[PDB]
């Protein structure tokens, strides 16, 4: 029996909800447990970063988000082939690799190849045997100075380029933005209809000539 004025409402409590009530009193204990597991992993891998391997500069799908840049699953095989790193060497030297990704854009391809070139320079590779170093190993001065990096290694920042104040030209003054938008809407709506009418008019012209 509703009273004078109020919102219509649909409470979803018609099931037996009191059996399945997830209480959240485990929350600070789980924060302590995640903290101890993370410190245990950081003490387990002693020179390696506590976060993990590096993750790609990634454009977002689904037009709400495509201006933003994320950290992705892993590097692409074409990215590794251009940078010159084998995909099984990359997992051993601490590089996220996934074979599912493609490379349609050239700019993001070059950006991830450049990020590989920066990470190969920033990487300090320790030798397998300390008594007998190999050809592709770091120097003894870098062996002592190498340490962990707290947080995400090379944190991806959404950079925006800075433009300067320009003088407005007569073509920019004479450009019609809303009219161009409406003409583009009309052409994208009527692209197939004009082509069908052109084919039908060509058929009428062939029927008139022949």
């Amino acid at each position: 029996a509703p009273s004078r004025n109020g919102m219509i409402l649909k409470p979803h409590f018609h099931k037996d909800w009191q059996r399945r009530v997830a209480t959240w009193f485990n929350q600070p204990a789980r924060k302590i447990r995640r903290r101890k597991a993370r410190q245990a992993r950081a003490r387990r891998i002693a020179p390696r970063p506590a976060a993990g391997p590096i993750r790609p500069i990634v454009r977002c799908p689904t037009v709400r988000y495509h201006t933003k840049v994320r950290a992705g699953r892993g590097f692409s095989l074409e990215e590794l082939r251009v940078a010159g790193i084998h995909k099984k060497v990359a997992r051993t030297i601490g590089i996220s690799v996934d074979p599912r990704r493609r490379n349609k854009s050239t700019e993001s391809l070059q950006a991830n190849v450049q990020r590989l070139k920066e990470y190969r320079s920033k990487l300090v590779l320790f030798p397998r045997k300390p008594s007998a170093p190999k050809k592709g190993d770091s120097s003894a001065e870098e062996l002592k100075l190498a340490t962990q990096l707290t947080g995400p290694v090379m944190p991806i920042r959404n950079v925006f380029k800075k433009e300067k104040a320009r003088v407005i030209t007569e073509e920019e003054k004479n450009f019609k933005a809303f009219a161009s938008l409406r003409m583009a809407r009309a052409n994208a709506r009527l692209f197939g209809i004009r082509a069908k009418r052109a084919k039908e008019a060509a058929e009428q012209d062939v029927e008139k000539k022949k």
Partner: protein, 102 residues
């Protein structure tokens, strides 16, 4: 007249150049290999044809293409698979006609 990159229209989207890379190797599944064609025509020679396929061959011999398409569509389901089976039966009917002629 300048043409700004528009989010809507016939050529919408942000202007990004496209590279020409090697296509994926998972895309070529179902490609007709010569050895698989040999195995396939081999077993077509050994086992023979199905009864509904023989009935559709008879419907193509009596020149009823629409009724043959309706029968193959009722037997196999979709119209695309029906048209492919009708073209395959017409091809093997032309092959049998050429073998009977010369």
């Amino acid at each position: 007249a300048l043409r700004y990159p528009m989010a809507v229209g016939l050529n919408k989207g942000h202007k990004v150049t496209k590279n020409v890379s090697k296509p994926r190797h998972s895309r070529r599944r179902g490609r007709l290999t010569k050895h698989t064609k040999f195995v396939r025509d081999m077993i077509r020679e050994v086992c023979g044809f199905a009864p509904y396929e023989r009935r559709a061959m008879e419907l193509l011999k009596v020149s009823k293409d629409k009724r043959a398409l309706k029968f193959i569509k009722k037997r196999v389901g979709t119209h695309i698979r029906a048209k492919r089976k009708r073209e395959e039966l017409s091809s093997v009917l032309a092959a049998m006609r050429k073998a009977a002629a010369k």
